[PDB]
Structure formats: C-alpha cells, structure tokens
C-alpha cells in the first residue's frame, strides 16, 4: 500500500488517538481520523454525518467549520494538503 507521512498537525491528531507511527497507509490515516472525530464527539448528535470542527484543531486541517462524511473530495483534498507521499 502507498505510504504517507503526515505533517505535524495531522500527525498530532492521529497520535492523540493511539497511532504510534510517523508513516501510514491511507487506510490507517482514515481509521485514526475517524477515531479522533468519534472520541471528541465532533459530529452532530442529531445529524450524525455532519462534523462540526470550527473550535477544534481538526477545523484548521480542513479549513472549514464543518463537513459531511459524504464529502470524499473535500476530505481527500484536506488530507493531501497535510502529508507528503
């Protein structure tokens, strides 16, 4: 699998939920980002596809105050800005 090296902020968030490494697969990046969002309950309780992140560090990764998990283009584009191949 293609390996990626998260930039400092992305790396910090992934490590905050138990990832121990500096190099990741895209599956692992998504796994730990998902766990990050879950464990900080950034999603809307009543509209659970929607993540509200304007006061979280996640909001600085995305550069938006919220997003839907359905928005794969936005999500992958954010991830692209925050790693090196």
From Swiss-Prot:
Phenotype for residue 34 to A: No effect on its ability to induce apoptosis
Subcellular localization(s) per the UniProt record: Nucleus, Nucleoplasm; Cytoplasm; Nucleus, Nucleolus; Nucleus
Superkingdom of origin: Eukaryota
Post-translational modifications reported in the UniProt record: Phosphorylated at multiple sites near the RING domain by ATM upon DNA damage; this promotes its ubiquitination and degradation, preventing p53/TP53 degradation. Autoubiquitination leads to proteasomal degradation; resulting in p53/TP53 activation it may be regulated by SFN. Also ubiquitinated by TRIM13. ATM-phosphorylated MDM2 is ubiquitinated by the SCF(FBXO31) complex in response to genotoxic stress, promoting its degradation and p53/TP53-mediated DNA damage response. Deubiquitinated by USP2 leads to its accumulation and increases deubiquitination and degradation of p53/TP53. Deubiquitinated by USP7 leading to its stabilization.
SWIB/MDM2 domain span: 2-85
Stretches the record annotates as Sufficient to promote the mitochondrial pathway of apoptosis: 1-77
Induction behaviour: By DNA damage.
Sequence segments annotated as region (Necessary for interaction with USP2): 1-85
Homology family: Belongs to the MDM2/MDM4 family.
Disease named in the record: Seems to be amplified in certain tumors (including soft tissue sarcomas, osteosarcomas and gliomas). A higher frequency of splice variants lacking p53 binding domain sequences was found in late-stage and high-grade ovarian and bladder carcinomas. Four of the splice variants show loss of p53 binding. Lessel-Kubisch syndrome: An autosomal recessive progeroid syndrome characterized by short stature, pinched facial features, prematurely gray hair, scleroderma-like skin changes, small kidneys and consecutive kidney failure, followed by severe arterial hypertension.
Subunit structure: Interacts with p53/TP53, TP73/p73, RBL5 and RP11. Binds specifically to RNA. Can interact with RB1, E1A-associated protein EP300 and the E2F1 transcription factor. Forms a ternary complex with p53/TP53 and WWOX. Interacts with CDKN2AIP, RFWD3, USP7, PYHIN1, and RBBP6. Interacts with ARRB1 and ARRB2. Interacts with PSMA3. Found in a trimeric complex with MDM2, MDM4 and USP2. Interacts with USP2 (via N-terminus and C-terminus). Interacts with MDM4. Part of a complex with MDM2, DAXX, RASSF1 and USP7. Part of a complex with DAXX, MDM2 and USP7. Interacts directly with DAXX and USP7.
Function: E3 ubiquitin-protein ligase that mediates ubiquitination of p53/TP53, leading to its degradation by the proteasome. Inhibits p53/TP53- and p73/TP73-mediated cell cycle arrest and apoptosis by binding its transcriptional activation domain. Also acts as a ubiquitin ligase E3 toward itself and ARRB1. Permits the nuclear export of p53/TP53. Promotes proteasome-dependent ubiquitin-independent degradation of retinoblastoma RB1 protein. Inhibits DAXX-mediated apoptosis by inducing its ubiquitination and degradation. Component of the TRIM28/KAP1-MDM2-p53/TP53 complex involved in stabilizing p53/TP53.
Notes on the domains: Region I is sufficient for binding p53 and inhibiting its G1 arrest and apoptosis functions. It also binds p73 and E2F1. Region II contains most of a central acidic region required for interaction with ribosomal protein L5 and a putative C4-type zinc finger. The RING finger domain which coordinates two molecules of zinc interacts specifically with RNA whether or not zinc is present and mediates the heterooligomerization with MDM4. It is also essential for its ubiquitin ligase E3 activity toward p53 and itself.
Additional information: MDM2 RING finger mutations that failed to ubiquitinate p53 in vitro did not target p53 for degradation when expressed in cells.
Name of this chain's protein: E3 ubiquitin-protein ligase Mdm2
Taxonomic lineage of the native organism: Eukaryota, Metazoa, Chordata, Craniata, Vertebrata
Full-sequence range covered: 25 to 109 of 491
């Amino acid at each position: 699998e293609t390996l990626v090296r998260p930039k400092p902020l992305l790396l910090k968030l992934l490590k905050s939920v138990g990832a121990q490494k500096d190099t990741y697969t895209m599956k692992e990046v998504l796994f730990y980002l998902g766990q990050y969002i879950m464990t900080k309950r950034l999603y809307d309780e009543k509209q659970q596809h929607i993540v509200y992140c304007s006061n979280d560090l996640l909001g600085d990764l995305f550069g938006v105050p919220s997003f839907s998990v359905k928005e794969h283009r936005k999500i992958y584009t954010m991830i692209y800005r925050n790693l090196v191949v």
